[PDB]
Amino acid sequence: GWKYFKGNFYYFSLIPKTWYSAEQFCVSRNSHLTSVTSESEQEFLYKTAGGLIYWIGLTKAGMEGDWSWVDDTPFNKVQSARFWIPGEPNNAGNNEHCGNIKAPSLQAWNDAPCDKTFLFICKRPYVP
Ligand SMILES: OC[C@H]1O[C@H](O)[C@@H](O)[C@@H](O)[C@@H]1O
Ligand SMILES: [Ca+2]
């Protein structure tokens, strides 16, 4: 069951996977792990997550370890600053190169090891 919000459908998984296995599941359903591009979308996502941890489309790109969205939405460092949990991203064990929705708050995101298994959220555009 996909949920609808502002022009996109979202799949909140019932089974946990690593970040990449999650992304492949999304891709098999003509989607991607979700990007987050506004306060209203962040709010929709974290509220729907209901306090459980879900992989989202956050991952590193480039030598400098810049964050990026797997669906290729340009990542806006300034506009996204308010969406991380205070203290994140912290790159623990120098091995946290993927991101999830963790806290039920506008400040929701944590960076975690890509090989950890969590539920996940796919995002699929509706094309009229
Ligand atoms: O204390 C916060 C810290 O908790 C755990 O160690 C992990 O979830 C880290 O990703 C996170 O940064
Ligand atoms: Ca972290």
Curated annotation (Swiss-Prot):
Effect of K116A: Loss of binding to 6'-sulfo-LacNAc and 6-sulfo-GlcNAc
Subcellular compartments: Membrane
Domain of life: Eukaryota
Outcome following mutation: E88A: Loss of binding to 6'-sulfo-LacNAc and invertase
Tissue expression remark: Exclusively expressed by Langerhans cells. Expressed in astrocytoma and malignant ependymoma, but not in normal brain tissues.
Disulfide cysteine pairs (residue numbers): C26-C122, C98-C114
C-type lectin domain sequence ranges: 5-123
Result of changing A103P: Significant reduction in mannose-binding ability; significant decrease in thermal stability; increased sensitivity of sugar binding to pH change
Function statement: Calcium-dependent lectin displaying mannose-binding specificity. Induces the formation of Birbeck granules (BGs); is a potent regulator of membrane superimposition and zippering. Binds to sulfated as well as mannosylated glycans, keratan sulfate (KS) and beta-glucans. Facilitates uptake of antigens and is involved in the routing and/or processing of antigen for presentation to T cells. Major receptor on primary Langerhans cells for Candida species, Saccharomyces species, and Malassezia furfur. Protects against human immunodeficiency virus-1 (HIV-1) infection.
Complex formation: Homotrimer.
Swiss-Prot/TrEMBL domain comment: The C-type lectin domain mediates dual recognition of both sulfated and mannosylated glycans.
Annotated disease: Birbeck granule deficiency: A condition characterized by the absence of Birbeck granules in epidermal Langerhans cells. Despite the lack of Birbeck granules, Langerhans cells are present in normal numbers and have normal morphologic characteristics and antigen-presenting capacity.
Name by which UniProt lists this protein: C-type lectin domain family 4 member K
Taxonomic source organism: Homo sapiens
Lineage: Eukaryota, Metazoa, Chordata, Craniata, Vertebrata
